[PDB]
Model the fold of this input.
Amino acid sequence: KIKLLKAAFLQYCRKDLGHAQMVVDELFSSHSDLDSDSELDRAVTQISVDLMDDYPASIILHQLEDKMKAHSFLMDFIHQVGLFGRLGSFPVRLLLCEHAEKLSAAIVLKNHHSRLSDLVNTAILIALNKREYEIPSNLTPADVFFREVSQVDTICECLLEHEEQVLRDSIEWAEVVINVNNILKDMLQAASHYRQNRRTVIIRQHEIVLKVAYPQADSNLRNIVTEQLVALIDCFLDGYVSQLKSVDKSSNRERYDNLEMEYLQKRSDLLSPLLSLGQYLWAASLAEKYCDFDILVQMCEQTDNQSRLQRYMTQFADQNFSDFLFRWYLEQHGQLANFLQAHEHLSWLHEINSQELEKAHATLLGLANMETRYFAKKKTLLGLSKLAALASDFSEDMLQEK
Amino acid sequence: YVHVVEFNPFENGDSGNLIAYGGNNYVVIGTCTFQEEEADVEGIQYKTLRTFHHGVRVDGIAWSPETRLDSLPPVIKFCTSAADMKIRLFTSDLQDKNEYKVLEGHTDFINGLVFDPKEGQEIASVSDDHTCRIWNLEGVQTAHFVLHSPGMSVCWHPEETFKLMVAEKNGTIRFYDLLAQQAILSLESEQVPLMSAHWCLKNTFKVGAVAGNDWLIWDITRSSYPQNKRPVHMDRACLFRWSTISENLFATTGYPGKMASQFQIHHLGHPQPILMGSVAVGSGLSWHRTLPLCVIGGDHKLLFWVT
Amino acid sequence: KYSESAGGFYYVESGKLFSVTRNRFIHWKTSGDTLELMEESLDNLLNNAIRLKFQNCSVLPGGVYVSETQNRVIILMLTNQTVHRLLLPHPSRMYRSELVVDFTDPCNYQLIPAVPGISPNSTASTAWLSSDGEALFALPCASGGIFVLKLPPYDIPGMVSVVELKRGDQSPSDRPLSLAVHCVEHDAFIFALCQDHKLRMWSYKEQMCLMVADMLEYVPVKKDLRLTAGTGHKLRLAYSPTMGLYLGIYMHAPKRGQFCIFQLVSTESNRYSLDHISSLFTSQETLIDFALTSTDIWALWHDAENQTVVKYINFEHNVAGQWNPVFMQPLPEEEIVIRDDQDPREMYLQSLFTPGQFTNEALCKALQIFCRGTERNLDLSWSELKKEVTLAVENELQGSVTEYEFSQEEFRNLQQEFWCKFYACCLQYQEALSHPLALHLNPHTNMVCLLKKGYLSFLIPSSLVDHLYLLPARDVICLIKCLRLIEESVTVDMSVIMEMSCYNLQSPEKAAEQILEDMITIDVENVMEDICSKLQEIRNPIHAIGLLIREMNIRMNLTQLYGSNTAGYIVCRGVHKIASTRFLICRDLLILQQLLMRLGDAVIWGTGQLFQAQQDLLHRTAPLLLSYYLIKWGSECLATDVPLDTLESNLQHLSVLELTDSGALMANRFVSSPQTIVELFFQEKPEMITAITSYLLQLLWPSNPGCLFLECLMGNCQYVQLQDYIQLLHPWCQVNVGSCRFMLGRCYLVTGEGQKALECFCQAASEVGKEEFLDRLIRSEDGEIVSTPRLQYYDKVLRLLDVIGLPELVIQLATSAITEAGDDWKSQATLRTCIFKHHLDLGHNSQAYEALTQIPDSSRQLDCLRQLVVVLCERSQLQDLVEFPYVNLHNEVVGIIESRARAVDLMT
Done:
């Protein structure tokens, strides 16, 4: 209730100077509590989340640095006493502290690069949610916006999309769409770089990836090369986040894991189709970031004349040839693609080219046995099988049997 | 609600491409045809045939095995649920309503309904008034039967008209019969509320999900195999088993903090697989008869993704 | 190891009270392998169980090693010849908080005299016999020595100088059997009885015997030519009690059984040091303990067959404590398999959890039934205990099969046999562990408290229902007894059917002539004529029954409040028992009324009771049915799940909300999925007066309060927790209450069922509201200077759908509200504007141009038309908005063109 939150928050302020008074409050609370992992464990997590969210919401840089410095000291005092668990994530609202730290790290990076468009976007996002106070404080929202970083990131795409309609896109107008993408990438990288030292968010990235692809068809080569890096860096982070979210739940409930796998595979195939018309250097980076979706790599290594790429991507993997053959059978460079696809039915030529007389003879015999609607074709297949068996250097008994 | 005619394409084999979508007005009907387009993306397109009229909100949908298709005419017989706490079961042809549905006998709000086909028209409903209605329409008028048992999701067993299943709101799964009354009664997780308890496609198992992502399987053909796993998120719309794989089930969800809903595919032995993941809330979902396409009904449209 | 795990060697219960501010501080303690202590006062809400581990349990002489001073918490024990001294604050610091940290020295064990096997072992400890109870402590050896240890504290907290002071004799005949302690005019006056039948009064100042009295009680008396040597020696127990300023003593006198009542008044003067003006009473002997209180002497007895017998002797020259005790009634050998409660383990669990007497016995039985894995007390929480027991019982009974099927007949028999074996084991494990020990009274609460062995109980007088259910101008007695005897002879299936029929008669009731046709399925023959012949030979019957029922509506006098744990649990148990008794009485009355006026589905057999012969019983059956429903709801409600812990003053203090180990550990008030009954007792001697009296008056009242108490209780419980049981409580309640529909809608919306919540809110939107649940709709309906039936709710739903993000549902609601306009008032423009806004926000079809041209042709509302045109132009509809504007008027089109042409911002 309200008595536990007012008591747990008072002991954290006095723990920075002493330790004997804060250790007596946890031992008595652990004995007075019900000590149950059903409903009693959710009461401590709800108070901890409220105490952690209040520290981040209280000199714009100094105020943001003080909250980030005070939030890190609260995690050590709770871990030294314990507070040995109390996990209450579930849906929407241990992961709460990480999310709060990521939000505090992403909110501090946006304040250092304050510009004319960023301030206008922040004001438009603050005015669209609620009303601001008329008594000075022209910021207009810092403590109330740092705790909810998902609202500022989702509303940033609406401000740039409104100005792009009246921009007549033209040279100087293309920099405004790249400045927001660079800021978004820098804010997303800060939340991912801080974790290693321990529906609304994906829509803003999916819309940005689609809007950045339309502006590359009427811009300079340098601008198109610079705008494609932010989209690739965002896609590599989104794929990593999806893999981390999917690898955190398994064993039981296989239906959810099977449903999420299809959604994760469909999102990677759509982004690889839009990037195939531009530079081919992003495919290797995407494959190194996310070790999945080999159909895109197999198509990139087949559409061009890079014969060594298919072998390099197969010798440094795990069971890549079996997947490449299955992808080729289900679909210079043209000759290599035809030889890779020739595995079933018409495989005698491939077996003869790959030095396999016995395999070619077996394939010809199988084709002649399966065929039953062309006497000329059945005779030609039998003749080819006989020629392959005569040319093969096998045993005398096998040759006589053939 | 959105549910395809899985029984018509199995126990009969006629109207397999029919898909009912009950909304606030009435219930629309769709057709799933296999056109060209692309075989790697989706080789099954959805075509809106006709839409019937009623005037009341339909909370559920359950087709029977008496549906046929002759030339352009199509006789259907599905059991829905009116908004006035009732379980209607009319039989219209194509788009015109040839018969009405006099549903009266539910004391509280209904929760689930089903329809079977043995000697005429057997329908089993379940309300919140601790009563399990069993309407049977034979040749001599009809026969009403009520039993003091709480239900939430009643479903008949496959290839067994004399057996049925009923899942209570407190976590009790009773398997009653039409002659020996109740026979067995199971119980899953009693600490949280239950969702549903439907059988598998092999007509020999009974999978029961809960509201707190607590699923339990009890296959009788696997020498009494009692598996129990847990999903990723909570399943508000229970779960839907596959028509070919008995160890596979799909359960939708809805994260309100990220404004994105995902449908994880639960499987015994496999890992967490989320093939479906839209940015909107899903009202219902149903698998096709080919075990490859998923007809997920949203709040304003209906998608058809193929895995 | 199962029978020697729990039991307890003795039981001690202290309790001091100040004569300045009336400070109450009561606490209970238990013995056994570890020193346990729990807070069980009656004043101070949040408590916790304390368990102090020892080295050798409680090695002493027998029932000693149990002393407590007036301060909290000063305790003194003696285990393995080692006197201990625990000083901590278990009343408003350690026990009041949930912390388990202590930065002070509480334990301070010391050895005053040489207490050993070959030297002088103690036999009776009495720390309150000296002056300072928190410093000095007297002890009595078996050889007649009365030692003391005055441990006065110095300047530093912890160190103390113990003053060794002993006064031994030289013979074994001066050994004290039981010493007493009392304070008279702020002076320590100890009174002990030696083994040589000599009552010696010792003082704490001079440390010597001040008075001495001789008592001849050792000569060989003969009764009916039978020489009996009076050498009766009891094991510990108590032979001297106290109340305030005087003390009492009694002698068993061999095997006579007459006891005594020698209450000696010890005045503090210089001419009468000891005076006794009392002989002996005719009551039984106190083999356990005896607590005297002014004129009432509460005695406790215990036999050799683990059977206790409490009896009160109030010396008031009028009436004493006449009370009869009940034995063990086995009610688990009857099989039942009807409707309502199906399955097999659920009914057994519900029958076992309806008792509320065994705690560790069930856990011990479950651990012993599951071999190869018997651990310790690792259960902790009681929420998963039932699931673990069910999983252990389901994995032990193998189901026999046959020919591709499952033999249910053998499985049911095996389950019944397992349940019977578990019940027998639970009854055998609790019969040898639940027995009396001692009894102590408190001066602050002034209530007769009892202390057993692991089961804290209390003594209360017999009420009206308890005296009427015992089957023991003066009528309405024989008929009620016959009705109760006829109702008690029914089977379990008939009772289950009656309960299932009464549970479904809450909302859609049908109280008519249908109970006689349903209660006649018990194959009754010669049982109805005998009742009819007795009912037909009575003059005034209904008029007497109504007067007897009115004299019984309970009414309270001076209402009070409380706030504890054990007292609250006892009050809840008493309220549940009273509700069960009331439900049984109502069922018996209904059965009697159905058997008397059964008619028989005939006109000639029914016209005899409707020919103006009596005064009917419509309102008599309606209040009886309401009371029966309330009693059934109270019996269905358990006793945990409280609400708030706001202890104010009189008739305002609430009970403890939590006071448990965790959320899943049902220790006092934690389980909320199957309880919700403690809040009604907390929001409304103190089980005798007036916590139970207020609850009884609130449950018996109907038209005086104006509303149902169940709806108010549900609304008060929904504000805290118990969200899982709220959906089950709202579905079985009446629909006649105004707040019941709102509570049901809130429970349906908080659980996820949006359709049920919408259906419940749409059916109540045409009447009144539920504060913020319909204040906006009420304001919107009042702003139109009218009262819409189905238009205001539709407009509110459309506004809520448009303000969220929907477009088709809001447009449909606006169209429905515009079509259903039965008011025909001047405020019809609000619906038209909403419909136009919905059509402009959605679009899709070309029907949006019809409303814009109609709203602008009736009045001067061009702003809505301009907004709709702007929305249609911004929604990418250049090829559709040009053709839709030609079908409207010319003036409106010209105005729209003039409003759209005024654009000072040119973009792409």
